């Protein structure tokens, strides 16, 4: 009953039977006759439907969803990692990185800055992924504490992204939270193509924890087995050259999670500069918007996540396709009251394109006419 | 200003000038003219002073100390370890051990059992020692949380024994506590002889963390540098064949710590059965009592720690030389209300000789006429 990757040849055959114009004519809250993955593929490949027209249709099909947007800010709690992903600066073989680790004091200080100075009520905790069982359990323990601590401070939504998770590691993290707490597990498969995955994440059976594709991809099934609800699959756009394959796999994974009763966000982060050991594929804005549009349209209750990997000009264009906006920096403990967050090449996972403070980014979204849930702008009579 | 091991040849020469009978005639609170280590050696080697007579003298020289005894119970929070000590079942190469790790729930439950059912107000937290910096920091983090949690529950004294500690690892643990909290760092050198140490703890530069003798031995100096106070050196009796060498080194280490203003307990645990990879030296009761007597006498403000490594019959004989009594089991989360603690060969560090419940052991000490501080016998109107 775990997720099984779809057979692309089978999806292609079903995609051939989809009437894409009829699909576009569907009322909001109406579901196509064919599978979501087949419809996504059919919309993707039918180039008589313009990308801008697909994006307009996606924004309308999602237009009823409330809240329109919510936010969380990432907080990297360490940049140690045992794995070796060739597109990521945190890879263990990158001896140039200055490695850092946040203790109790620093984690708490960062959460207070985010809460009081940035006005945010969503946070995400990130770590590397570790090889030996004891380290994995001790990481789960510390992140469980961070989650409980953020909820107790008044954060209303907590994400975590700490690697694949086995049953006993979920047990350790879970002793910190309740089954109905607003806690989302993030595990981005990066590529659902096993060969591209191996190229970037490494080979198995050699002490490289994220090289195990199968352990990673069933992490959400373990989380749902344990009685939790919120999950966040993702694809790293720019690893695999064939985007049609990845959108089929992601939509199929979302559909599986939906059928198990999960609430899923969907992440499609695009590559950013990093201290890489292998080059990646640059995906143009039209393809990327078409991918976002097709996923958002076929998965209208699963919010796309948009992040400050993208520059301000792209956020302007794409924000209507998103249901989560996540501004922040992938450096360890980077926030400081009144100051721009750090994004030091010597310690960050990658370089972001937008370094403006979260409360400025989110305040400008609100001023342009979209409320952001889990954002309390620290102004006026809410100004301290 | 770190501890420097004494030159045994130099101590021997000073020991030759000690008048051991005059030393015995010293009033309590009077200090011999020669160094503590030289006097200890001189008492050890002067076989015209009987061991029983040395033990009587030691008990009298310490007789004024208050409280006469205090207690703590060990709580092993995991039996994972990266090191390879050949006398220890937890060594990483022991593939027979069932490896266990206590999360938040289990640690808290164990502390509540110890507090309410055993009546104890001292606890010690133990782990393995880990190789990579991230694991060491995450272990320090979790043990710091355990220490804070025990203090908040009303434990009045907390020991920890989690391996050598570098400055940044002490920083992480330290964010959990205050500089004047009743927290004792334990780091038993095991043998102060570098060659015996290498034989059992392994060779350096190969991923075996406790093989670094120097990192280990200056851990207390780092702890004092950070502004803490309480420390607990130790020798594992039965590693090195020449006990006179080890008592000189231990007494010299205690004297150094005293000169830095520390409060030091001294541990001389004797070997117990384990899943070993090298045999050890059995030390008879007369030599062991003579060693305890000479250390207790020359170091009258530094409490010897006696544990349930020893059988009831030996505790009866030696308890007068101790200032700390520590009953318990070296298995992970072994305590259960109303039941004997577990000491499973499949998961414990070694097999103890006395498996009676701490409150029985400590209640019998109290009934025989020695109060035990940090023990509240759960009886009568203190019975719940
Ligand atoms: C936390 C997420 O960040 C993504 N990720 C990893 N490396 C990079 C990069 N150079 N640029 C952008 N995103 C990256 C992965 O999808 C990872 O899961
Ligand atoms: C926690 C302490 O237990 C001691 N130690 C390690 N192995 C054994 C054994 N087989 N028997 C008794 N004590 C042991 C070490 O001195 C270690 O530092
Ligand atoms: N979800 C991946 C981490 C993240 C969320 N928001 C971000 C902004 C910038 C960099 C990473 C993130
Ligand atoms: N101080 C070493 C751990 C310890 C304290 N008391 C014990 C009793 C039995 C075994 C270990 C201990
Ligand atoms: C910092 S990257 C995300 C978390 C984890 N290291 C992983 O790659 O799954
Ligand atoms: C469990 S043995 C004591 C703690 C640590 N593993 C060390 O040997 O120092
Ligand atoms: S993507 Fe995550 S697991 Fe891979 S190297 Fe980076 S931090 Fe480590
Ligand atoms: S004595 Fe401590 S470091 Fe050595 S193998 Fe045992 S638990 Fe590990
Ligand atoms: Br809204
Ligand atoms: Br790039
Ligand atoms: Br809110
Ligand atoms: Br007393
Ligand atoms: Br033995
Ligand atoms: Br007490
Ligand atoms: Cl994302
Ligand atoms: Cl001891």
From TrEMBL, chains A, B:
GO MF annotation, one: metal ion binding
Gene3D superfamilies found in the cross-reference section: Aldolase class I
Binding site for [4Fe-4S] cluster: 81, 85, 88, 210
Binding site for S-adenosyl-L-homocysteine 1: 76, 87, 190, 210, 216, 272, 309, 349
Signal sequence segment: none
InterPro entries per record: Aldolase_TIM, MIA_synthase, rSAM, rSAM_sf, ThiH/NoCL/HydG-like
Residues that coordinate or bind S-adenosyl-L-homocysteine 2: 190, 210, 216, 309
Name assigned to this protein: 3-methyl-2-indolic acid synthase
Gene behind the chain: nosL
């Amino acid at each position: 009953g775990d997720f099984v990757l779809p057979e692309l040849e089978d999806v292609r055959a079903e995609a051939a039977t989809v009437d894409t114009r009829a699909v576009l004519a569907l009322a909001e809250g109406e579901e196509p006759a064919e599978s979501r993955a087949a419809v996504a593929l059919a919309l993707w490949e039918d180039r008589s439907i313009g990308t801008a027209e697909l994006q307009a249709a996606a924004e309308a099909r999602c237009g009823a969803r409330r809240p329109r947007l919510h936010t969380f800010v990432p907080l990297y709690t360490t940049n140690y990692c045992d794995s070796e992903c060739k597109m990521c600066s945190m890879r263990k073989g990158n001896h140039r990185l200055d490695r850092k680790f946040s203790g109790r004091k620093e984690i708490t200080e960062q959460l207070e800055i985010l809460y009081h100075h940035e006005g945010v009520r969503g946070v995400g905790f990130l770590t590397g992924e570790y090889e030996d069982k004891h380290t994995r359990l001790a990481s789960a323990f510390r992140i469980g504490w961070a989650i409980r601590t953020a909820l107790d401070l008044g954060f209303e939504r907590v994400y975590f992204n700490i690697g694949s998770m086995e049953q006993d590691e979920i047990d350790v993290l879970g002793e910190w939270i309740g089954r109905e707490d607003p806690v989302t597990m993030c595990v981005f498969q990066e590529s659902y193509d096993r060969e591209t995955y191996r190229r970037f994440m490494g080979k198995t059976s050699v002490g490289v924890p994220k090289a195990d594709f199968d352990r990673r991809v069933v992490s959400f099934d373990r989380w749902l087995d344990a009685g939790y609800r919120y999950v966040n699959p993702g694809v790293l756009v720019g690893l695999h050259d064939d985007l049609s394959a990845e959108l089929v796999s992601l939509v199929a994974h979302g559909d599986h999670l939906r059928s198990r009763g999960a609430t899923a966000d969907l992440s499609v982060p695009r590559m950013r500069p990093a201290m890489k050991s292998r080059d990646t594929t640059r995906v143009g804005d039209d393809d990327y918007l078409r991918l976002m549009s097709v996923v958002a349209f076929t998965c209208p209750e699963q919010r796309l996540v948009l992040t400050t990997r993208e520059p301000q000009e792209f956020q302007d264009v794409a924000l209507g396709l998103a249901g989560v906006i996540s501004p922040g920096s992938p450096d360890v403990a980077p926030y400081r009251a009144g100051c721009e967050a750090r994004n030091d090449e010597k310690s960050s996972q990658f370089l972001v394109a937008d370094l403006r403070r979260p409360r400025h980014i989110l305040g400008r979204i609100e001023a342009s006419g979209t409320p952001v849930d889990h954002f309390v702008n620290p102004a006026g009579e809410a100004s301290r």
